[PDB]
């Protein structure tokens, strides 16, 4: 590990600097180094880890979609053959994306999930595990695609079960998990009815729990609830 010689606190500090500079690749590398120190992450540190990798892989996914679209058009009736280059470059981006997903899943498996006992950490990491299997599923085609989809589903499901037992319906992690699992159902698992049902139930149960919250907790929560509503409007 190239971060093995840097203090944990310095890695955290530099991840925050990288976030301010929108240097998400650096941010992710700093937080990988911090995780590899072997200590549990605090609430704030977990968010630095998730945001860094979400942004790295988000950019990869956007680029992959651009290239996959060009590739699909290159294979339509009437398109001039243009050689292997579009496929090759799409594959290059895809392999880099898979590498980042594998790295995140490895951090979760070694050993963030096994040491996470509190609901807010365990649900968080299992959500991330579902998310990174979902990104693998978006580009998957071969013998293991179903296993990749089922790995995403299994991680999201375990997170869901814990979240419903241990967290209030307005908890932002619980809400975000439900949002993303609903998207998994719609876009990955060919289950739009399940996606809609989950988004609606989650929204309605959160609405009914808002009265228990402070102004600041209400602000959080309502923000993710609006994303659930946005997706429902797209889907209905």
């Amino acid at each position: 590990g190239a971060m093995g010689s840097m203090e944990r606190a310095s890695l955290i500090q530099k991840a925050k600097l990288a976030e301010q500079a929108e240097r998400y690749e650096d941010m992710a590398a700093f937080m990988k180094g911090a995780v590899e120190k072997g200590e549990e992450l605090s609430c704030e540190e977990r968010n630095l880890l998730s945001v860094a990798y979400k942004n790295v892989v988000g950019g990869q996914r956007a680029a992959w979609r651009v290239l996959s679209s060009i590739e699909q058009k290159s294979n339509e009736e009437g398109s001039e053959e243009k050689g292997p280059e579009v496929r090759e470059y799409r594959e290059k981006v895809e392999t880099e994306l898979q590498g980042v997903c594998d790295t995140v899943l490895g951090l979760l498996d070694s050993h963030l999930i096994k040491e996470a006992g509190d609901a807010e950490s365990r649900v968080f990491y299992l959500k991330m595990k579902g998310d990174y299997y979902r990104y693998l599923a978006e580009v998957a085609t071969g013998d293991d695609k179903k296993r990749i989809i089922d790995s995403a589903r299994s991680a999201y499901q375990e997170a869901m079960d814990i979240s419903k037992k241990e967290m209030p319906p307005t908890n932002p992690i619980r809400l975000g998990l439900a949002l993303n699992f609903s998207v998994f159902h719609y876009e990955i698992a060919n289950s739009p009815e399940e996606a809609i049902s989950l988004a609606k139930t989650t929204f309605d149960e959160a609405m009914a729990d808002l009265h228990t919250l402070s102004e600041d907790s209400y602000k959080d929560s309502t923000l993710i609830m609006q994303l659930l509503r946005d997706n429902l409007t797209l889907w209905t």
Binding site: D131, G176, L179, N180, V183, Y186, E187, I224, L227, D230, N231, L234, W235
Partner: peptide, 5 residues
């Protein structure tokens, strides 16, 4: 695309 967090 739909929203995720």
């Amino acid at each position: 695309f739909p929203a995720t967090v």
